[PDB]
Design a protein around this ligand. Structure first.
Ligand SMILES: C[S@@+](CC[C@H](N)C(=O)[O-])C[C@H]1O[C@@H](n2cnc3c(N)ncnc32)[C@H](O)[C@@H]1O
Ligand SMILES: [Mg+2]
Length: 238
């Protein structure tokens, strides 16, 4: 009939964040794919699979005109791999850090690939715990004040974000230190890096007070580990 493609959120930093639904999907997949270096992450991901889908290898796919050429080749690669490793009624799982819906290209890639390679499949998305949810849980805070909007955005977008939206915003994908550029005396920040993991680091306080310190810390950690992923929440406590 058709194959099932599970797109499975595997959470952030720890195997404890996996849902029952995710575990069922992993255990029923006849093949596992991940579109991707960060050795710590590869190791965490393998640990999740070793625990729940032991005996199933992870097929990890890694990267002008060249990008467009790579996408076509990647599409052919994915379709061929799926057809080889699963029967016509079988199931493949794609692993996605956090939740598949949030700042991730896997679903888009799958949809493009299916169209280009004429791959008949039922796509089923399985939610997972996002970095945002780990940040708020580890700090023991609410993501909003009563009735308040929540603006989730990127470091690149932050300087162009309205003051009104910056009253309660979550910032992802910040390669720099964008809190320094938008803070007032009332701006409070909850920050975290390597959330969920044994190398988790949390900081909080007024940007007035801690912003330069966290900027220094983020560089220290990046030099040490070779990379860093942080998420933070800014709130105007006026
Ligand atoms: C490519 S997006 C993927 C988001 C993912 N789908 C999710 O639901 O969390 C990567 C961004 O997520 C955040 N991030 C992911 N893992 C993190 C972690 N363990 N600690 C802190 N931030 C993390 C950072 O903002 C990072 O730049
Ligand atoms: Mg205040």
């Amino acid at each position: 009939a058709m194959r099932t493609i599970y797109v499975i959120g595997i959470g952030t930093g720890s195997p404890e964040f996996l849902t029952l639904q995710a575990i069922s999907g992993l255990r029923h997949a006849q093949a596992i794919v991940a579109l991707d270096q960060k050795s710590d992450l590869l190791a965490l991901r393998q640990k999740i699979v070793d625990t729940h889908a032991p005996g199933t290898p992870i097929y990890a796919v890694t990267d002008e005109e060249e990008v467009r050429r790579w996408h076509a080749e990647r599409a052919h690669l994915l379709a061929s791999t799926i057809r080889e490793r699963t029967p016509d009624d079988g199931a493949v799982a794609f692993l996605v850090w956090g939740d598949p819906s949030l700042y991730d290209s896997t679903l888009r890639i799958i949809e493009h690939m299916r169209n280009l390679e004429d791959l008949h499949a039922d796509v089923k998305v399985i939610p997972g715990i996002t970095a945002v949810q780990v940040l708020t849980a580890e700090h023991g805070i609410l993501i909003n004040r009563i009735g308040e909007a929540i603006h989730i955005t990127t470091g690149r977008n932050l300087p162009e974000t309205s003051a009104k939206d910056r009253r309660n915003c979550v910032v992802m994908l910040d390669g720099k230190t964008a809190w320094q550029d938008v803070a007032t005396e009332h701006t409070y920040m909850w920050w975290g890096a390597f959330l969920g993991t044994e190398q988790q680091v949390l900081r909080k306080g007024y940007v007035h007070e801690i912003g330069a310190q966290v900027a220094e810390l983020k560089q220290q950690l990046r030099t040490e580990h070779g990379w860093i992923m942080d998420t933070y929440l800014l709130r105007e406590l006026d």
